[PDB]
């Protein structure tokens, strides 16, 4: 009873899961890696 | 409620729906054509079997009884015989809209609010357990209200879009409406062990907050508990007005929720010996604990998520707006203050 | 609980009355009873204040809007029975009689004094009518008014308030129209400069305090609050009734231990203040008159299904 | 949108492809041939760009349907190039097969 | 006394301001000062010992 | 470092309903 | 910009108490608060009226546009 | 008469008429909790409350249930009758003191 | 109207500052209590707003010339006055024999503000007004030209006064950067009421300040209520106290021989309930700011109303009846649903 | 720049000076550090719009094509999943779950 | 007398076709006078 239904637009709703958090990766902290947004760009 | 939306009377005047008229609805519709453009709840205009509209506008009180003694009359033309006249009536309570803040980065920011039109009002008003979703900050942001308009698309608005249907997040599956500010330093102190309350205020308490007159007719009588203590006295604790909440809006049918969970108060601020940390709910009532951002916030295993996992969404929703009412008619009545002392 | 047990109980206590401000306790009535006469007295007791302005001209530096406003904020010194209500649902012509509306007018044309004492900073010298006050406002009674107001003219409660001020060749010329309104509606109809109460305070001492503690004690407490005693030297409570409930005694450490400060708390100390048109006591009356008509107004209503 | 009118064809795919000069000119409501549009009376030029078989314009009615400026879906007309041009849209291929 | 400056309202002051504006000067310099680099420099173009 | 000024000759200036300065 | 005629939350009429006011401190030789209680100003609501006015009409009144300076 | 002032809410009450709710227009706090002080008084009243469902429309709404022995509209009638009698003693006693005064 | 400020820098007085008041002295209350005041809305109370509390005005000045488009020195064709041709008559409840409005005449949209005769046309015609938001006439000034006289009237400017009472949505702020919205214009008989007998001009939300650390609104609450009961004005510049002479002591102190609670708390009681509340409440006088509006804030709600010729869509407006746009992030977020027919 | 004040007693004009450059930094990086997160959203919804969850429980595109076999290799709501493996809190509540 | 003039203060009157400014000081800047009329006002 926790299946995903047929029909669940699956597709747009990763799109915002990863669109819409990332908007909190907007500025930064302070290896030495690329970070937040310009990585999940690259 | 959390699930409502407040509409100003200037848009609820002017956005209409149309009403195919029936056997079922002949007197509501009568009445609304009665009622006319700007009386609500009303209605603008008239289509009729031939697909042609007519302006209820210009028209005087006696023109309108007239049309509206007309609305069911049978069919004198074989090619329309099939139809029925359609009544654009005025925006009501038994309506849904959908609400949209922009960005909307998901789709919790455009949900299925139901309709309450507040006589007086010149803008939207929101329950703040909505802000969560929509990021909205009272500061002067704007939202849209949009009104479906035909039955597909109401179905799908209260049923797939609504807002009781998105209490968890798609991105991590945890929770994203709950209670802030007023209400969590009410529950603090209503919970409190230190908390009483004579038969009086709590009875006064529940009703104010149940609102029984509404679809969670679990009981077309309201339950209330033994008090607490006997003697000398007769008192009841906070603990038990969430006990009794909780008792007349789950299902009669169904045993009560059991939850042993935490907040985030330590039992060293309560003293000695104190339990106060621990949140324990057997058989629906509260037995330990204080009530916190933890258990009534947006908030992954307190005792609203538990509740929205053990009875569904609608229960869970309606726990959400009747605690909203309890906390906001408990700081009402002792209100809470902050100062140069603290 | 009974009608007849609390008219036994039920007592008034009439401190100070005046014919601007009364001081009085209601003892022993429940707290959602003095609460309904408190917000009835501020807000449902009808009163007379102008509502509808009527500018001829204007060339002051005030603006209409505004100078419209605080003519409605002049309480008028008229008896509210005197007067119908108005219906709201009647055009303009029928809607104003003289069991319905006072009309005020106001007419000053401000001109240049010659004869000003040469070096002069007072207005009253250098102009002409500066300055408009609301015993001003001139009451012009219409129809049978001129019979019934005839031995009480319609006053401002309240002559010397300034109302605008002028320089030469400007002039103000208005009527008003004035009716029965009520503060819920307006702030401008209600008919107190304030009724409120506060509920006796009680300080109980939890055990003797005597001597250097006593005058310390004492002296925690506005004078005559606290009164020691000659023979135990131990301090008791003359009159919590004075008491502002500062809870400085809190403050001292050796006090904190041995006071509770609580009230009685069906015990409320009333002050009503009137803001000029009707005595306290007779706006205390209307309160107790038009709760008890609320009741029975509902008494009387058919329960529609 | 109203659920009292109902529509029993349905679109079910769309087709890409090119206009020939045969189709145009056979579909074609009028040629227009007049720079000018309008004249002294602010009418429509015959034969110019408003020339009402394209369509009611202002408070004229369509001269290819009779309807008025509400009802009348307008109707497409031709210009004949006295001298072929290239498509401008296609250049870059014709320029390849070359 | 002879102390470090206190707060007033200056309400006597401030009215009878407001009625006699003053023949002389004004009465807040410190407002004067605070526009001087405009009014300076403008005045820069003209004045000068050099024309 | 002087402390801020002490203003001299501060009283009463609040009683409870139903009384005034001179009941004190 | 001229006297308010009620307290803002009392309700208490101050518009008759300007004038006053400015009397008791120009000519008695009173300060502030002495001349405020001598109004019959009591609660701070009240007193705050009258102790922070500021009559900027008195400015305004000195352009007038109908008179000949 | 006026029928639009007081309504039964037929959706909250019982069968036996000991168990109702009532919606009353033009009222807020100073009626409705004096009259809940009242009807509570009553020792057939077995639940007893009132509320305001929003500060925007002029509504109050009681609720009153009965223990079985007087139906919940006898309550209602019984508290309105106990707070004008309330009224009643509260304006006299006034009266004399004013007069002993 | 404007007042000093209690609590003042005395630069305040160096600058001149009360010759441009830019604010008042409210009372205010932190309290949780109407539940309309979370997320940094803010009360106002009703009857204060009633008695003038905050009240404010709104100028603008627009510029007619009829000389806009005639080529330079050209023949005048548009006159300010009536014609004597056939014209509405309605027109003058608006203007003047001249063509110009009264001074004082309330002015809505659509209303005429300006009637002149067009020579071209051989008809009188009119300049309506435009704003959505109706307003008084306050000066119409005649604009003349030099270049020594001969020219008649070409060049008018009407200045228009617009009431701005405070409505819900106004933003009010203390001067301490705590900016609010007003939420609700609460009844006075509503609002908590004090031991001494008051209510409270604003209420703002005890939550509004620990994220915010303004710890110097506290103080100018002690130190203004201190300064309204003694008659004094009290000297708030920086850096005047410090760790062994805080001003919470000083305020305190003198609320104490004022005869009020030293830490600045007041007792107080429900609106609703008439009940004292559980705790002290703190109260105090602090100067408070009305925000100017920046915003066309103004509501729209369509039905139908006027297309676009080429797409058929609803017009972009308001000020006509345009249509609000769903676009590409709503749409995706009604595919997000999986709501086929709310897309559609 | 270490300030023993606090905001109870006051600040030193030392404190506060240093204080202030604390206060402007975030709002500095701010205005010249932020990166937008829009297009890069739009993007993946513009390339995401109609992959879905198909009768069959694979993860289709519109057109067919099948991107998964199965939604996280077992087809869970994650809207529905908070308490699958809460085995405690599903054995308390037993008989409701039932 | 529909006019005032913005220097001189003279109230003074104009025709068709006439000097748009005031006949004593010769200032071309002229107020629009308040004359007598009703404007009614709501007293909240
Ligand atoms: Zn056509
Ligand atoms: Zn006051
Ligand atoms: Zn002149």
């Known amino acids: 009873r926790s299946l995903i239904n047929p029909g669940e637009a699956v597709g747009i709703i990763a799109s915002q899961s990863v669109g819409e958090p990332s908007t909190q990766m907007t500025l930064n902290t302070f290896a030495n890696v690329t970070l937040g947004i310009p990585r999940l760009r690259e | 409620e959390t699930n409502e939306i407040g509409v100003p009377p200037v848009f609820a005047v002017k956005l209409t729906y149309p009403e195919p008229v029936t056997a079922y609805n002949i007197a509501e519709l009568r009445q609304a054509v009665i009622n006319g453009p700007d009386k609500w709840p009303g209605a603008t205009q008239i289509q009729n079997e031939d697909g042609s509209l007519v302006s209820l506008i210009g028209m005087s009180v006696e023109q309108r009884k007239a049309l509206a003694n007309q609305l069911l009359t049978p069919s004198s033309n074989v090619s329309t015989h099939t139809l029925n006249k359609k009544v654009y009536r005025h925006i009501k309570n038994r309506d849904v809209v959908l609400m949209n803040r922009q960005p909307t980065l998901h789709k919790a920011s455009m949900m299925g609010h139901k309709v309450r039109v507040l006589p007086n009002e010149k803008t939207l008003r929101l329950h703040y357990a909505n802000t969560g979703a929509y990021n909205a900050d009272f500061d002067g942001d704007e939202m849209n209200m949009h009104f479906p308009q035909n039955e597909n ?120 010996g104190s339990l106060e940390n621990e949140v324990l709910f057997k058989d629906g009532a509260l037995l330990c604990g204080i009530l916190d951002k933890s258990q009534y916030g947006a908030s992954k295993y307190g005792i609203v998520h538990s509740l929205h996992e053990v009875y569904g969404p609608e229960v869970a929703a309606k726990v959400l707006s009747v605690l909203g009412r309890l906390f906001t008619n408990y700081i009402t009545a002792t209100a809470f203050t902050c100062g140069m002392d603290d | 609980w009974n009608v007849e047990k609390f008219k036994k109980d039920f007592e008034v206590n009439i401190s100070s009355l005046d014919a601007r401000e009364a001081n009085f306790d209601l003892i022993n009535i429940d707290t959602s009873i003095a609460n309904a006469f408190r917000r009835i007295m501020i807000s449902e007791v009808p009163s007379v204040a102008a509502e509808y302005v009527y500018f001829f001209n204007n060339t002051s530096v005030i603006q209409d809007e505004v100078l419209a406003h605080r003519i409605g904020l002049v309480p008028l010194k008229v008896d509210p029975d005197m007067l119908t209500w108005v219906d709201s649902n009647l055009p303009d012509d029928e809607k104003f009689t003289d069991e319905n509306t006072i009309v005020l007018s106001l007419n000053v044309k401000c001109t240049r004094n010659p004869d000003a004492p040469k070096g002069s900073t007072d207005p009253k010298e250098l102009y002409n009518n500066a300055h408009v006050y609301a015993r001003d406002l001139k009451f012009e009674p219409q129809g049978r008014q001129s019979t019934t107001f005839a031995d009480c003219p319609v006053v401002p409660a309240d002559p010397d308030i300034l109302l605008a001020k002028l320089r030469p060749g400007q002039e103000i010329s208005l009527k008003a129209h004035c009716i029965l309104g009520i503060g819920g509606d307006h702030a401008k109809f209600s008919p107190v400069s304030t009724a409120s109460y506060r509920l006796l305070p009680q300080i109980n001492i939890l055990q003797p305090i005597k001597g250097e503690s006593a005058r310390r004690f004492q002296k925690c407490f506005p004078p005559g609050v606290i009164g020691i005693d000659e023979g135990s030297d131990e301090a008791y409570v003359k009159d919590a009734r004075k008491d502002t409930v500062s809870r400085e005694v809190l403050r001292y450490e050796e006090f904190a231990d041995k006071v509770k400060l609580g009230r009685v708390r069906n015990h409320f100390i009333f002050n009503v203040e009137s803001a000029g048109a009707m005595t306290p006591e007779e706006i205390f009356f209307k309160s107790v008159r038009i709760l008890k008509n609320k009741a029975e107004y509902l008494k009387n209503c058919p329960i529609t299904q | 949108m109203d659920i009292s009118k109902p529509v029993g064809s349905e679109i079910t795919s769309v087709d890409f492809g090119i206009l020939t000069a045969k189709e145009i000119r056979n579909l074609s409501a009028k040629q227009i041939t007049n720079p000018t549009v309008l004249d002294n009376l602010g009418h429509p030029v015959s034969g110019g760009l408003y020339d009402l078989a394209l369509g009611a314009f202002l408070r004229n009615l369509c001269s290819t349907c009779g309807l008025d400026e509400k009802f009348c879906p307008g109707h497409q007309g031709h210009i004949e190039l006295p001298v072929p041009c290239y498509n401008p849209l296609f250049f870059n291929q014709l320029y390849i097969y070359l | 006394p002879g102390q470090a400056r206190t707060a007033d309202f200056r309400t006597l002051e401030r009215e009878s301001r407001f009625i006699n504006p003053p023949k002389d000067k004004s009465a807040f310099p410190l407002l004067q000062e605070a526009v001087q680099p405009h009014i300076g420099s403008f005045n820069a173009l003209t004045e000068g010992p050099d024309g | 470092r002087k402390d801020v000024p002490k203003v001299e000759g501060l009283k009463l200036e609040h009683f409870a309903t139903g009384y005034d300065a001179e009941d004190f | 910009m001229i006297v308010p005629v009620r307290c803002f939350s009392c309700g208490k009429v101050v518009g008759d108490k300007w004038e006053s006011y400015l009397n008791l401190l120009q000519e008695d030789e009173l300060d502030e608060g002495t001349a405020l209680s001598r109004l019959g100003l009591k609660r701070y609501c009240c007193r705050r009226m009258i102790l922070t006015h500021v009559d900027l009409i008195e400015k305004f009144l000195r352009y007038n546009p109908l008179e000949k300076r | 008469p006026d029928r639009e002032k007081i309504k039964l809410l037929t959706q909250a009450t019982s069968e036996d008429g000991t168990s109702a709710s009532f919606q009353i227009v033009e009222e807020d706090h100073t009626l409705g909790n004096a009259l809940r002080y009242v009807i509570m008084k009553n020792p057939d009243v077995e639940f007893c409350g009132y509320s305001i469902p929003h500060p925007s429309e002029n509504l109050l709404n009681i609720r009153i249930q009965t223990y079985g022995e007087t139906t919940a509209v006898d309550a209602l009638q019984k508290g309105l009758k106990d707070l004008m009698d309330l009224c009643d003693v509260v304006e006299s006693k006034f009266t004399e003191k004013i007069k002993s005064m | 109207t404007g007042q000093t400020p209690i609590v003042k820098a005395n630069l305040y007085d160096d600058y001149g500052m009360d010759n441009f008041p830019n604010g008042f002295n409210a009372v205010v209350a932190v309290i949780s209590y109407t539940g309309y005041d979370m997320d940094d809305a803010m009360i106002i109370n009703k009857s204060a707003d009633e008695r003038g509390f905050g009240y404010g005005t709104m100028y603008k000045t627009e510029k007619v010339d009829l000389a806009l488009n005639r080529n330079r020195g050209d023949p005048i064709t548009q006159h300010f006055g009536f014609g004597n041709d056939e014209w509405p008559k309605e027109w003058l409840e608006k203007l003047d024999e001249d063509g110009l409005p009264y001074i004082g005449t309330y002015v809505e949209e659509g209303d005429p503000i300006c009637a002149y005769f067009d020579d071209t046309l051989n008809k009188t015609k009119i300049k309506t007004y435009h704003s959505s938001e109706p307003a008084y006439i306050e000066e119409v000034n005649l604009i003349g030209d030099e270049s020594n006289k001969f020219q008649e009237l070409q060049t008018v400017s009407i200045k228009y006064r617009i009431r701005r009472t405070p409505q819900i949505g106004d933003k009010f702020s203390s001067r301490h950067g705590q900016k609010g919205v007003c939420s609700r214009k609460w009844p006075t008989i509503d609002m908590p009421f004090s031991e001494t007998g008051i209510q409270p001009d604003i209420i703002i939300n005890p939550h509004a300040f620990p994220s915010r650390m303004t710890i110097g609104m506290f103080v100018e609450s002690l130190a203004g209520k201190a300064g309204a009961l003694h008659g004094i004005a009290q000297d708030s510049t920086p850096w005047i106290f410090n760790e062994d002479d805080t001003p919470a002591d000083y305020f305190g102190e003198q609320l104490a021989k004022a005869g009020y609670n030293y830490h600045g708390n007041e007792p107080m009681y429900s609106g609703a309930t008439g009940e004292e509340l559980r705790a002290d409440i ?63 | 720049g270490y300030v023993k004040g606090r905001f109870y007693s006051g600040i030193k004009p030392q404190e506060y000076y240093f204080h202030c450059m604390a206060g402007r930094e975030g709002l500095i990086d701010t205005a010249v550090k932020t990166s937008r997160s829009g297009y890069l959203q739009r993007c993946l919804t513009k390339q995401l719009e109609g992959v879905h969850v198909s009768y069959d429980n694979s993860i289709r595109d519109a057109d067919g094509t099948l991107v998964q076999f199965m939604y996280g290799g077992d087809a869970i709501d994650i809207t529905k999943e908070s308490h699958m493996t809460q085995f405690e809190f599903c054995l308390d509540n037993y008989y409701a779950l039932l | 007398l529909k006019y005032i003039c913005a220097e001189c203060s003279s109230k003074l009157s104009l025709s068709r076709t006439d000097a748009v400014r005031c006949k004593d000081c010769g200032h071309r800047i002229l107020l629009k006078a308040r004359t007598k009329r009703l404007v009614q006002f709501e007293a909240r």
Not at chain 2, 237 to 258: E, R, S, Y
Not at chain 9, 317 to 344: C, N, P, W, Y
């Open chain 2, 153 to 272: 698309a109401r179905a799908e608005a209260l049923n797939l879009a609504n807002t009781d249907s998105q209490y968890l997040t798609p991105t991590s599956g945890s929770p994203v409406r709950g209670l802030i500010q007023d209400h969590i330093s009410a529950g603090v102190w209503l919970t409190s062990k230190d908390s009483f309350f004579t038969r009086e205020q709590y009875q006064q308490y529940i009703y104010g907050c149940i609102r029984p007159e509404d679809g969670h007719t679990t009981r077309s009588k309201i339950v209330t508990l033994p008090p607490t203590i006997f003697k000398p006295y007769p008192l009841w604790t906070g603990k038990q007005i969430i006990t009794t909440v909780l008792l007349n809006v789950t299902p009669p049918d169904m045993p009560g929720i059991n939850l042993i969970s935490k907040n985030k108060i330590k039992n060293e601020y309560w003293g000695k």
């Open chain 9, 282 to 344: 703190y109260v105090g006088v602090v100067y408070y700011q009305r925000l100017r509006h920046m915003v066309n804030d103004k509501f729209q709600v369509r039905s139908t109303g006027p297309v676009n010729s080429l797409t058929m869509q609803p017009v972009k407006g308001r000020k006509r009846h345009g249509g609000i746009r769903v676009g590409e992030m709503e749409r995706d977020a009604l595919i997000g649903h999986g709501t086929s027919f709310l897309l559609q």
